[PDB]
Amino acid sequence: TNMRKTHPLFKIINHSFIDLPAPSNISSWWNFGSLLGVCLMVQIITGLFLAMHYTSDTMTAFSSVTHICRDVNYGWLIRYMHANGASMFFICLFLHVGRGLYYGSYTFMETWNIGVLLLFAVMATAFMGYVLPWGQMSFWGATVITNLLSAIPYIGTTLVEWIWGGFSVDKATLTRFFAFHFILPFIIAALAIVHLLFLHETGSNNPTGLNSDADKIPFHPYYTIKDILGILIMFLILMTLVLFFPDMLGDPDNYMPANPLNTPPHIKPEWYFLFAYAILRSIPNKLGGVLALILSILILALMPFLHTSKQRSLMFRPITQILYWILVANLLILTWIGGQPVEHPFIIIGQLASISYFSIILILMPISGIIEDKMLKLYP
Amino acid sequence: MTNMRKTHPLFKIINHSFIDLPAPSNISSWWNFGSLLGVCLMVQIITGLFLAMHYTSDTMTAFSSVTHICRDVNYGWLIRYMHANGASMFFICLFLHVGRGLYYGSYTFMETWNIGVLLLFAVMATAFMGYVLPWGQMSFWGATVITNLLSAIPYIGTTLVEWIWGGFSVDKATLTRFFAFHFILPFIIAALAIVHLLFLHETGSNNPTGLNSDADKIPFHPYYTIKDILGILIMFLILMTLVLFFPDMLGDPDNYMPANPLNTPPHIKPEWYFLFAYAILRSIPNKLGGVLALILSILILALMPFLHTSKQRSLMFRPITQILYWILVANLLILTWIGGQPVEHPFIIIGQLASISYFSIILILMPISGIIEDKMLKLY
Amino acid sequence: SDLELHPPSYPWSHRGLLSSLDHTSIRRGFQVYKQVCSSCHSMDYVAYRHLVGVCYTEEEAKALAEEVEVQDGPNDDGEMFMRPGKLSDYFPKPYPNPEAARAANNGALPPDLSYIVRARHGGEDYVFSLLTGYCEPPTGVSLREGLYFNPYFPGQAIGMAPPIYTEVLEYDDGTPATMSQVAKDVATFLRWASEPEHDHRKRMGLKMLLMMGLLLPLTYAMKRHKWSVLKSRKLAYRPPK
Amino acid sequence: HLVGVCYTEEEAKALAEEVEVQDGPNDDGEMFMRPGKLSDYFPKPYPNPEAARAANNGALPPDLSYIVRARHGGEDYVFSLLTGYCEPPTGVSLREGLYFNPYFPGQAIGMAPPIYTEVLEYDDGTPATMSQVAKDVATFLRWA
Amino acid sequence: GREFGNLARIRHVISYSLSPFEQRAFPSYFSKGIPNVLRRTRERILRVAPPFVVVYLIYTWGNQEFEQSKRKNP
Amino acid sequence: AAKNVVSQFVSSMSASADVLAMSKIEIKLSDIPEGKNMAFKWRGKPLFVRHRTKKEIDQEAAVEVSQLRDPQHDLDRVKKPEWVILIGVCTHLGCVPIANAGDFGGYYCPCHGSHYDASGRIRKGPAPLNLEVPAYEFTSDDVVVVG
Numbered sequence A: 001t002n003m004r005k006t007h008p009l010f011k012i013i014n015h016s017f018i019d020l021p022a023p024s025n026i027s028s029w030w031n032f033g034s035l036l037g038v039c040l041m042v043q044i045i046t047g048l049f050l051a052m053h054y055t056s057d058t059m060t061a062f063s064s065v066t067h068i069c070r071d072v073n074y075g076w077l078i079r080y081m082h083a084n085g086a087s088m089f090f091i092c093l094f095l096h097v098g099r100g101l102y103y104g105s106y107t108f109m110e111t112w113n114i115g116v117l118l119l120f121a122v123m124a125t126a127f128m129g130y131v132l133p134w135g136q137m138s139f140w141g142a143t144v145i146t147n148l149l150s151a152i153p154y155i156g157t158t159l160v161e162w163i164w165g166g167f168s169v170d171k172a173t174l175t176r177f178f179a180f181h182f183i184l185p186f187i188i189a190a191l192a193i194v195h196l197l198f199l200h201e202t203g204s205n206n207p208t209g210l211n212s213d214a215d216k217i218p219f220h221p222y223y224t225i226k227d228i229l230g231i232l233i234m235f236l237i238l239m240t241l242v243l244f245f246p247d248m249l250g251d252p253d254n255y256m257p258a259n260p261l262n263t264p265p266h267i268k269p270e271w272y273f274l275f276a277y278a279i280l281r282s283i284p285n286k287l288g289g290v291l292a293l294i295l296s297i298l299i300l301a302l303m304p305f306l307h308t309s310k311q312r313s314l315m316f317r318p319i320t321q322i323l324y325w326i327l328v329a330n331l332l333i334l335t336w337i338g339g340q341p342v343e344h345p346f347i348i349i350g351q352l353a354s355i356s357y358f359s360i361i362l363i364l365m366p367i368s369g370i371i372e373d374k375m376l377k378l379y380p
Numbered sequence B: 001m002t003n004m005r006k007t008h009p010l011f012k013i014i015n016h017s018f019i020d021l022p023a024p025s026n027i028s029s030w031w032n033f034g035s036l037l038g039v040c041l042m043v044q045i046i047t048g049l050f051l052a053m054h055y056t057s058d059t060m061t062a063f064s065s066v067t068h069i070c071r072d073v074n075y076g077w078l079i080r081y082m083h084a085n086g087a088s089m090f091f092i093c094l095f096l097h098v099g100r101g102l103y104y105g106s107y108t109f110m111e112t113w114n115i116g117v118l119l120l121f122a123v124m125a126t127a128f129m130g131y132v133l134p135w136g137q138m139s140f141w142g143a144t145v146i147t148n149l150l151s152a153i154p155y156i157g158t159t160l161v162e163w164i165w166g167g168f169s170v171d172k173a174t175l176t177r178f179f180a181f182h183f184i185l186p187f188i189i190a191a192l193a194i195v196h197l198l199f200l201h202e203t204g205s206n207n208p209t210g211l212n213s214d215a216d217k218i219p220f221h222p223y224y225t226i227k228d229i230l231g232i233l234i235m236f237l238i239l240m241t242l243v244l245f246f247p248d249m250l251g252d253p254d255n256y257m258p259a260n261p262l263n264t265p266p267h268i269k270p271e272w273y274f275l276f277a278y279a280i281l282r283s284i285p286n287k288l289g290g291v292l293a294l295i296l297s298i299l300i301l302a303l304m305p306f307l308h309t310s311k312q313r314s315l316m317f318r319p320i321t322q323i324l325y326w327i328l329v330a331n332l333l334i335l336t337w338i339g340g341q342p343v344e345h346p347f348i349i350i351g352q353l354a355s356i357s358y359f360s361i362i363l364i365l366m367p368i369s370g371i372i373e374d375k376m377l378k379l380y
Numbered sequence C: 001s002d003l004e005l006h007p008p009s010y011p012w013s014h015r016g017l018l019s020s021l022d023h024t025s026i027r028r029g030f031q032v033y034k035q036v037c038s039s040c041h042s043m044d045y046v047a048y049r050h051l052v053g054v055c056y057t058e059e060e061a062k063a064l065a066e067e068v069e070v071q072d073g074p075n076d077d078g079e080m081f082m083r084p085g086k087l088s089d090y091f092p093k094p095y096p097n098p099e100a101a102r103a104a105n106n107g108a109l110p111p112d113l114s115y116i117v118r119a120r121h122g123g124e125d126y127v128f129s130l131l132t133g134y135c136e137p138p139t140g141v142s143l144r145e146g147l148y149f150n151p152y153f154p155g156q157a158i159g160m161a162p163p164i165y166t167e168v169l170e171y172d173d174g175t176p177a178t179m180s181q182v183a184k185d186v187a188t189f190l191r192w193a194s195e196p197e198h199d200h201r202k203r204m205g206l207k208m209l210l211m212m213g214l215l216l217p218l219t220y221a222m223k224r225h226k227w228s229v230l231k232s233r234k235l236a237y238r239p240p241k
Numbered sequence D: 001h002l003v004g005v006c007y008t009e010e011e012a013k014a015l016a017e018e019v020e021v022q023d024g025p026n027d028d029g030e031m032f033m034r035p036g037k038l039s040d041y042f043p044k045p046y047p048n049p050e051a052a053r054a055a056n057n058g059a060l061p062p063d064l065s066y067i068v069r070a071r072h073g074g075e076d077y078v079f080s081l082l083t084g085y086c087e088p089p090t091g092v093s094l095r096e097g098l099y100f101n102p103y104f105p106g107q108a109i110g111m112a113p114p115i116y117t118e119v120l121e122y123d124d125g126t127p128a129t130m131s132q133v134a135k136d137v138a139t140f141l142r143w144a
Numbered sequence E: 001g002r003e004f005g006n007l008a009r010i011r012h013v014i015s016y017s018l019s020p021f022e023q024r025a026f027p028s029y030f031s032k033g034i035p036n037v038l039r040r041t042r043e044r045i046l047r048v049a050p051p052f053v054v055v056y057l058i059y060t061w062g063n064q065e066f067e068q069s070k071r072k073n074p
Numbered sequence F: 001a002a003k004n005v006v007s008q009f010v011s012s013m014s015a016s017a018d019v020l021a022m023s024k025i026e027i028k029l030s031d032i033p034e035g036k037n038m039a040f041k042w043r044g045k046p047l048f049v050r051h052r053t054k055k056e057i058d059q060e061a062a063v064e065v066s067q068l069r070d071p072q073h074d075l076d077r078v079k080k081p082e083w084v085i086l087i088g089v090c091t092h093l094g095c096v097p098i099a100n101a102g103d104f105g106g107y108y109c110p111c112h113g114s115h116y117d118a119s120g121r122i123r124k125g126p127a128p129l130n131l132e133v134p135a136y137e138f139t140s141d142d143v144v145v146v147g
């Protein structure tokens, strides 16, 4: 008789958010993915209120951005909220991925694959969105990334000309990047619905890695109020970042208009790309660097086939815990190296960091799992 | 082993919706039309995406960008005129779909009907703002006329219209926000259509007889799949002979001039899918009353579930209400013809009689005819 | 040269977390820009209406806008004509195109100073270090004529002549116009020119800090209520053996 | 836009280099007067519509880029307008600077009758009668 | 499909809970929190901290080596 | 907090400071004599303003209302009949009318030959309507602010 279990619109809400059985012991890290959804929604809303005054022509892009920040009522709040929300979105995304790696959540293979497709989509969305304000570093980072994407033999030059709409980054590139940056978050939202559907088919994972069917609680009100508290905390960091220091994560050189004649002495993207850029500087080969970038994103999708243990989480695997924190440390090292000049000693440090990164993910972690199985009297 | 079609968590939805969905065997070609609408919707989106790749929402560079699409972009004329003529064909399929729902008694599915009315409002708003977008003379003056009749609302109309405008008249703020809203609205229409199909699939579809069709039901594949491919190809035939042979028989010549606030056209009218609404508006000598009558015309279309006073669902065995239905359809054709005419003799009295007969047939004469055939068949 | 010199951290009155700008300094720096810096540099994104309620009143900014001529038009015979400036007009260009700016300044283009403290590392401190930092070049370097030695400019070869000296202009409020005072005032004004929303942003940040300091413990209290339903749960086992 | 339609690249290049186009600015910061190129648009007679109204006595001559598609009748309207200049009937008086064309709305156009017999010379030896010139320019405006 | 009532088979387990209106929201907060925070820190600090310590060391070494590289070589 | 942020976004959708700057910043001066009509640029449109006399007030009041192509009397146009403030735009094609001409001493459109009176009512031409009177507010009598 009740509309919660009978009405077909409310039935999906009931079985996804109200009466969904959830483990009672999942920590605050399980907030983060839900935070990601809110971040995406927030970005879309702010993006819509940025689309109401942005003009996507090269003569009136930077001027339209200054008109947003100077004449539109609280347009500075909307634009800097959009930029710092993108940064906080990548913070939540990195912690969501690292939690999936630590607690063995990649055994949900379809959920993991939809996740890495979402990661590729949001990285492309962020890159094109940074191209959009048409600053100096926007135009020069776009030119650098596309002309290194031109490194595929016999296909690369035609592909980068068709991506550019011409010989370089120009008005056609800006218009098509505005259209593509508009269209991508809705595809991201649909893929997030498929992500949640693939998760809810099999249930979620607890930090101990055991079977949580012995003790499960309804999602409401427990994780409802936990997610509300997480949303409030995320809004605290986001509003502190937008209302006190709007430029620790930005670049001053993007406040100059785009000059094709002038190249900057240092060209770098944002920090969530920077470590990948460090890998892109690690190998002195064009095509090898491009494949290093693509495999540096795709070995996360490869890791469900790298599980050689009979225990799921890392809570009872201390050597792989140490090696995982060495991996996160190496990621911080690569993030620092990516924003450094191409000069000694950063070359050998970046090469050592990339070698350590691929060695830890590819080689050392299954060996650590095998010897942990041997020491627990499991492996022959 | 297992059946991958029925057990995969993603393929189960496609299997339940388009493969093994039980459908009535005796549904006619009108049951193609709604599926065609969905196809036409995504066609619009695809063409719109490419029209978003070369268009600049700015009053100095909107008309010039449209001419640049028509002349300089490779096959840009084809995609633009496909977008416009597919909008017209989208409304053709819309009116035939709604007329199918009215004739065959498909409005007894009340939640599906009201969701469809919401989709109808959303697509009308999308087409209105999209017609404003190329910034011709008729675009600017039609936007001015619609916003002035919105400003006819007492004590909140002026504030609402200067907040919709972003200023004291139609300017580049209005153009940019109309571009943003015209971009974002079809994805809302797509999600709402997903809800529309969800409610229909949990309530089942209707046969033209109106009887219980559970005795003779067939899978959607491979009958209605190939029937809808044939309908899609016929819809492509009409759309392609409209785009390739008569590109401007439905278009407005005065839209091919740049927008001038100083010069007003001698005749101002909206497009042909707004003309019956405009003729209903123009008949009543009260602007608040005219807007009230327009909104309540679409709302009595929404209210049509509550006027069903007959024991038979469809109009297949109800010839008096069939006659009244065709009087209503011909009256809609008359209102469409009057809406493109000026306020001269004898169009005022004809339009007033047309609107009076339209509201009388929808509200009064159809339940009276239903009661008359109920008595006349000894039903009560 | 390749080696650089980072500017230090000067203790501005707006350096703090909630400390707003000094609007008298912004007014004095606007007078500095109008009297000194407007001959070579432009302020394309700041109009005369932005000064109303920040440094000047409505009539004072109206007089400031009326003091300069704007090429408006076209007239009914299709001609450009001079008109007195109004409040809706932006600050006037020194040169119509950057090519004449490069011609009149020996190749170097003076940048538009609407974001010059937002587009430089170190902010307006660097601007202060550019203005009070001119010195005699050391032995070893011999820069080309038309250039000047500034150790804070990258490459240490700036095309800008030193524009500030003592009593370069007069102040209407009787403040002594030393070179350091003029540089500090124009740095405050250029900080305002990049962030007109600075004081409002800090006020909203103060309200946010108080508001979140109110609502983090309260939301934590409701969470601890609903989850202390479960956090005192006691479980026991009764096997029949 | 004329190459591959009516002219070769050499003929269209000569047509572009016939007319002069303002371009610049130079390194000194001044606008110079260069010969035209293939990428250049067609030269405007007036820089702004105000001098257009001044030179043509208030009336602004419109852009004939979509003048076929902006008018009912298409090129039939252009052909009837150019070959329909007739004397006004009795009962209506026409002031100086206006001309009677019945196909114009209001029937008092401000355009002086532009074409007559042998108004120009054709390259291919076609007899340049008024109706032939009007038909050719209507075909060209339909192409435009 | 995977709702309550058929998740797992559990026998002979007794569970006790109170109303939230009978128990405190923060019962003995720091007296049982600071020992538990110190205990969790004790169990995890030797596996978390030394990678970040050696990252800090490599970062400071790289900064000073960059500054020595920019320095003159008489 | 929710009411505040909803107010922020709603105020963002409203009219910006740039479009609010282009209105209500016009100052009509007192150095304009009797009978001298000039155009100001208001909201992207020409605006004719002229100072008149009582003779033209009585002349415009002598014109009836019911026989007009567009019925409007002089007091319903302006509450100060000695100041005439209209929009100098031809309502048919968009030309610029020329004031202080004709039988009644008003606007003249040269593109087609339209004759207007001093108030702005249609008297000859293809224009089917009058000239729209903009709203205004009263400062000290030297200065009137249109809009």
Ligand SMILES: CCCCCCCCCCCCCCCCCC(=O)OC[C@H](COP(=O)(O)OCCN)OC(=O)CCCCCCCCCCCCCCCCC
Binding pocket: B319, B320, B323, B327, B330, B331, B334, B350, B353, B354, B357
């Ligand atoms: C007889 C055939 C002679 C020719 C031979 C060739 C063959 C032709 C077909 C023969 C068919 C034989 C019979 C089989 C068909 C079924 C019966 C049928 O259709 O009968 C005709 C029908 C009778 O009415 P019926 O619906 O059967 O029942 C009503 C209750 N007495 O009658 C009707 O439906 C008549 C409907 C008339 C409607 C007139 C409407 C007038 C007003 C219109 C206003 C509309 C516009 C309003 C605008 C207002 C604003 C300006």
Ligand code: HEC
Binding pocket: C032, C033, C036, C037, C038, C039, C040, C041, C105, C108, C109, C110, C111, C116, C127, C130, C131, C153, C154, C157, C158, C159, C160, C161, C163, C164, C186
């Ligand atoms: C004409 C003599 C000028 C006067 C007056 C002012 N400036 Fe200038 N400035 C001028 C030139 C030719 C240049 C470019 C020199 C170059 O090598 O690029 C500049 C540059 C600046 C800059 C930018 C410095 C940078 O690192 O990008 C700033 C911040 C600057 N000038 C400040 C400034 C101020 C505050 C002035 C008023 C006192 C001022 N300038 C006047 C030429 C001239």
Ligand code: HEC
Binding pocket: D056, D059, D060, D061, D062, D067, D078, D081, D082, D104, D105, D109, D110, D111, D112, D114, D115, D137, F111
């Ligand atoms: C200067 C004497 C002109 C010559 C040479 C040509 N035209 Fe013209 N035309 C002229 C003016 C001042 C106007 C303005 C409208 C008016 O009131 O007269 C026009 C208008 C046109 C139009 C538009 C007609 C309409 O109804 O909008 C067309 C289609 C047109 N003119 C065609 C045309 C052609 C084909 C010409 C070359 C033979 C030509 N004009 C020359 C003035 C002048």
Ligand code: HEM
Binding pocket: A040, A043, A044, A046, A047, A048, A050, A051, A054, A065, A079, A082, A083, A086, A089, A122, A123, A125, A126, A129, A130, A131, A132, A133, A181, A182, A183, A184, A185, A186
């Ligand atoms: C469909 C929704 C979105 C729209 C309409 C949108 C629109 C815009 C616009 C107009 C800009 C340029 C204005 C500016 O300078 O900030 C922009 C910038 C940006 N966007 Fe988005 N965006 C959307 C979603 C996203 C998402 C999901 C991300 C995160 C991946 C994102 C990341 C960015 C970034 C990083 C910038 C650059 C910020 C800056 O340089 O100022 N956007 N976006």
Ligand code: HEM
Binding pocket: A029, A030, A031, A032, A033, A034, A036, A037, A040, A093, A096, A097, A100, A105, A106, A108, A111, A112, A114, A115, A116, A118, A119, A122, A188, A192, A195, A196, A199, A203, A204, A205, A206, A300
């Ligand atoms: C686009 C950004 C993303 C969004 C919006 C998103 C959304 C979500 C949501 C809502 C959940 C369920 C709540 C939760 O468990 O925390 C979830 C869980 C999960 N996500 Fe994501 N996710 C994103 C990115 C990713 C990526 C990149 C991966 C792959 C590394 C991933 C893998 C997972 C996994 C494995 C789980 C389930 C683990 C568990 O529930 O214990 N997600 N995600």
Ligand code: HEM
Binding pocket: B041, B044, B045, B046, B047, B048, B049, B051, B052, B055, B066, B080, B083, B084, B086, B087, B088, B090, B091, B123, B126, B127, B130, B131, B132, B133, B134, B182, B183, B184, B185, B186, B187
């Ligand atoms: C999200 C998908 C869509 C996008 C991105 C989009 C984008 C655009 C753009 C850029 C224009 C201006 C181009 C031009 O007309 O010269 C336009 C025009 C138009 N659009 Fe859309 N549109 C979309 C969906 C739709 C839909 C669903 C309809 C309704 C069926 C529609 C109806 C129109 C109409 C009537 C025009 C005016 C065409 C004309 O110039 O005559 N659009 N659209």
Ligand code: HEM
Binding pocket: B030, B031, B032, B033, B034, B035, B037, B038, B041, B097, B098, B101, B106, B107, B109, B112, B113, B116, B117, B119, B120, B123, B193, B196, B197, B200, B204, B205, B206, B207
């Ligand atoms: C906006 C575009 C629309 C789309 C894409 C759409 C889509 C569909 C589809 C795919 C079906 C199932 C196939 C069929 O039986 O025709 C359907 C059926 C239906 N729709 Fe829509 N629809 C649209 C507009 C509307 C509107 C405006 C209404 C309300 C008047 C409406 C009411 C219905 C009803 C009542 C049915 C069930 C009819 C039956 O199956 O017997 N739809 N629609």
Ligand code: FES
Binding pocket: F090, F091, F092, F093, F094, F095, F109, F110, F111, F112, F113, F114, F125, F126, F127
């Ligand atoms: S053009 Fe002015 S009255 Fe017709």
